[PDB]
Write an enzyme that holds these catalytic residues in place. Structure first.
Site, PDB file in Angstrom:
ATOM      1  N   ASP A   1      -0.191   4.956   1.443  1.00  0.00           N
ATOM      2  CA  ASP A   1      -0.379   5.893   2.492  1.00  0.00           C
ATOM      3  C   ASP A   1      -0.698   5.062   3.828  1.00  0.00           C
ATOM      4  O   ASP A   1      -1.215   4.166   4.045  1.00  0.00           O
ATOM      5  CB  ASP A   1      -1.730   6.671   2.214  1.00  0.00           C
ATOM      6  CG  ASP A   1      -1.983   7.586   1.259  1.00  0.00           C
ATOM      7  OD1 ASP A   1      -0.940   8.469   1.037  1.00  0.00           O
ATOM      8  OD2 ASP A   1      -2.966   7.550   0.468  1.00  0.00           O
TER       9      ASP A   1
ATOM     10  N   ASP B   1       0.794  -1.087  -0.209  1.00  0.00           N
ATOM     11  CA  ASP B   1       0.094   0.081  -0.006  1.00  0.00           C
ATOM     12  C   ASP B   1       0.990   1.307   0.173  1.00  0.00           C
ATOM     13  O   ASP B   1       2.101   1.112   0.204  1.00  0.00           O
ATOM     14  CB  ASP B   1      -0.937  -0.062   1.240  1.00  0.00           C
ATOM     15  CG  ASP B   1      -2.261   0.802   1.052  1.00  0.00           C
ATOM     16  OD1 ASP B   1      -2.135   1.926   0.114  1.00  0.00           O
ATOM     17  OD2 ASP B   1      -3.246   0.380   1.466  1.00  0.00           O
TER      18      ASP B   1
END
Lengths: 273, 273
Positions: B27, B25
């Site tokens: 963020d 991922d």
């Protein structure tokens, strides 16, 4: 407002040592929320996880926590509604701690072999306060006897430090039979403040206050201060951040997100003392 | 189990560079959750807070976030129920971003003057991966164009890095008109995985995977991997910790609580490559 925060701090510096007192929570406020990727224990966890509690009882304690934590952080319930459950949560946990027949004499080992940690900068915090005889009042919903063993063993239980928490009641065997006095929990800090009016009246001249907390409740900790002239409120936001950030910026003067030190408080102290 | 984690990691070391790929991922996974007591921005925040959005529109965006965040973290709603709102949340935020007529040419400045930060250890992460030509696949619900400006400007957008996110659609003016392709959001990572089957089929030999995420959803990011032999799942738990800790210990192989570095991943890489 950053301007307003400076007006306050300037008041504090003008007052210097002679007018200052400190009010502060303990768990996640003076102790650490997490360390090296690991969640640090609260005073309650120290006991729950120690070798004097059985695997089975530790499991019952965890079920309690999962049921009752979810109510504590329910968005729909008012605090009105939540209040009896917070009470229930403590009575049952305490209930189970009684059954294990915990020996007073064992606390020292329990704390010594736990993963508990104070924030970076704590010796400097506590020493600097002792050296100017600044009254420090620690108001915790945790467990007084554990809290005291953490600070004693860290070498920072100085005479200016007053501890007020849920203290253990022992019997003749020196084995836990219950809890003294009225229950401190997250929702009734205000009642606990006014219940300690005698301590605060002895500090009438100390009209400049720094308050350190970690919850919304903690904002009430100064509700029994006799003379308030300037008060700085410092908030540790360690969890439920996105949910609570606005509310915190809204009510604490300084909000410190996931901050495992006392450096901001120590620099403010440097200017005052 | 710590034993099981070692079995996996031993598989990875045996495979070495030739069999490894990374899924991650962006963020709060490669970027920081908070820094120096301050909440760091997500790709969405970078835009919401920049000088090309008006005070008024920034205020409408915040109301959206407060309404829709509370539904996202509702304990009673199933994900079934939450799914249309997550969709609504993005369509409206995007809706408002369109109106401001954001200039493509401005992204570089926007990102350069924001408070965004990568975790400690990121140059070493990214360089070490590039130097062994390890495929790295970044699957984010954020904004592709922002994500890319963060990594380009950090000097770590290397050729092994594939970015898949919600990319901005511009018009003739080079001014935002919408979003390309299908929406990536927290609840449909699995659909997004299988929607990228063509990339994964080109990596059949890379049957050892390290996955890095920050939510439960992120666990689905490897659902379109062609050949799975060994997979290590590393989870960053930055928020809603007490609520989610058990669930995370339950499903990620490694759970790192409020950890703003990539040191654990970097030490695992050191052993493999």
């Amino acid at each position: 407002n950053p301007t307003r925060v400076e007006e306050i701090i300037c008041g504090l510096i003008k007052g210097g040592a002679a007018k200052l007192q400190i009010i502060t929570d303990f768990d996640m406020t003076l102790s650490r929320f997490s360390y090296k990727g690991k969640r640090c224990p609260t005073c309650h966890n120290i006991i729950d996880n120690c070798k004097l509690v059985t695997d089975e009882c530790r499991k019952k304690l965890l079920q309690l926590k999962e049921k009752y934590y979810a109510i504590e952080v329910d968005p729909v319930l008012t605090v009105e509604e939540k209040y009896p459950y917070m009470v229930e949560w403590y009575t049952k946990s305490h209930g189970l701690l009684v059954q294990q027949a915990l020996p007073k004499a064992k606390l020292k080992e329990i704390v010594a072999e736990s993963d508990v940690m104070l924030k970076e900068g704590y010796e400097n915090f506590f020493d600097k306060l002792q050296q100017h005889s600044i009254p420090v009042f620690i108001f915790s919903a945790g467990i007084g006897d554990v809290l005291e063993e953490v600070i004693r063993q860290a070498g920072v239980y100085h005479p200016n430090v007053k501890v007020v928490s849920n203290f253990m009641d022992f019997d003749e065997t020196g084995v836990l039979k219950g809890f003294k006095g009225e229950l401190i929990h997250v929702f009734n800090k205000h009642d606990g403040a006014l219940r300690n009016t005698e301590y605060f009246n002895q500090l009438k001249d100390n009209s400049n206050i720094i308050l350190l907390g970690d919850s919304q409740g903690d904002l009430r900790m100064a509700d029994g201060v006799a003379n308030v002239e300037h008060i700085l409120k410092i908030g540790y936001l360690n969890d439920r951040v996105d949910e609570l950030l606005e509310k915190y910026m809204d009510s604490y003067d300084i909000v410190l997100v996931q901050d495992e030190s006392l450096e901001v408080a120590n620099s403010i102290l440097q200017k005052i003392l």
